[PDB]
Amino acid sequence: GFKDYGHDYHPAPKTENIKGLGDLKPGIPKTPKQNGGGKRKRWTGDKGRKIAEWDSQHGELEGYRASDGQHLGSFDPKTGNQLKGPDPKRNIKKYL
Amino acid sequence: GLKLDLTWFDKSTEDFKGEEYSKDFGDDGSVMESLGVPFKDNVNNGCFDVIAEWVPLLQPYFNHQIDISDNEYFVSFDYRDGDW
Ligand SMILES: [Ca+2]
Ligand SMILES: [Ca+2]
Ligand SMILES: [Ca+2]
Ligand SMILES: [Cl-]
């Protein structure tokens, strides 16, 4: 019963409160989930050269390079700190 | 409690045009119920394409006049505890 579902995953920051990553703007969400119909909340920054997406299991922003989709690692929306480094296996090229 | 996070983008360019949250619905999940979106794995987890048959079911909760002819609209179902 509901509101247990609420606590299932980490709620996403509001666009205004994403600190220390530059000015941000929502971008059309394209990255699909497997167990859902949800596409991942997406923001862009640095004039659209950087992409952040919400990882609601981990509670962290995953960052990427728009030109080729490269993973930049993960970031903490409250402070903008890098929490994990770039993982060269990972990218979003197929969902740009 | 529960807020619908509505977001929309220009059809031609894909540029961001606007974001608006609904008022809080507390623990009443029946708005989701009426869109046929199961609670499971969908609360706090992804945006959903706002299709034509969803417009009349959402328009009440928003100031923005939703024009699916002009823009791509997405809703996501966000949950935090209390007034947020
Ligand atoms: Ca996405
Ligand atoms: Ca992760
Ligand atoms: Ca028109
Ligand atoms: Cl409001």
Side-chain angles (χ1 to χ4, degrees):
Chain A
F2 188 95
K3 100 140 286 165
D4 285 309
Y5 294 83
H7 294 102
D8 273 348
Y9 299 114
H10 293 272
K14 337 221 278 201
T15 304
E16 328 127 56
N17 311 147
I18 311 187
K19 307 325 293 170
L21 288 157
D23 302 321
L24 299 172
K25 268 184 326 199
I28 274 172
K30 292 194 164 142
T31 302
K33 285 258 75 190
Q34 223 71 207
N35 307 344
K39 294 176 213 138
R40 236 131 80 123
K41 286 158 172 299
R42 177 179 295 178
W43 297 265
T44 59
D46 174 32
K47 312 287 173 187
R49 280 185 289 254
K50 294 182 169 208
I51 294 169
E53 293 202 328
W54 186 239
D55 171 356
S56 76
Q57 336 218 172
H58 291 14
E60 65 188 7
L61 286 160
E62 307 275 25
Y64 304 83
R65 197 202 298 140
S67 43
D68 64 349
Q70 265 328 107
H71 178 61
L72 301 170
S74 31
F75 307 75
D76 151 48
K78 315 273 218 162
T79 64
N81 303 325
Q82 201 201 247
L83 299 169
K84 303 179 185 160
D87 170 340
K89 297 197 78 178
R90 288 179 72 188
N91 84 76
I92 54 174
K93 198 185 154 195
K94 75 174 296 192
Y95 308 122
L96 297 175
Chain B
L2 162 72
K3 289 176 170 73
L4 306 192
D5 183 0
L6 186 62
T7 206
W8 65 92
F9 304 77
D10 183 86
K11 269 176 161 155
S12 308
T13 61
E14 288 192 313
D15 289 330
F16 168 76
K17 287 267 276 290
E19 176 155 26
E20 189 190 318
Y21 290 91
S22 83
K23 303 277 173 189
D24 207 82
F25 280 85
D27 298 347
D28 185 344
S30 49
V31 60
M32 281 189 68
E33 221 128 44
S34 47
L35 306 153
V37 180
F39 302 164
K40 206 197 68 186
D41 296 322
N42 295 323
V43 170
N44 275 329
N45 207 197
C47 313
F48 283 84
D49 284 42
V50 178
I51 55 187
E53 319 98 80
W54 280 16
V55 188
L57 303 155
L58 302 165
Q59 194 48 98
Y61 310 104
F62 303 87
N63 294 342
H64 170 88
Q65 292 318 278
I66 298 170
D67 184 1
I68 65 165
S69 88
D70 279 13
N71 330 289
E72 292 180 48
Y73 284 85
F74 308 73
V75 255
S76 93
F77 307 96
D78 303 352
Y79 190 105
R80 280 212 250 241
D81 290 338
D83 185 355
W84 64 280

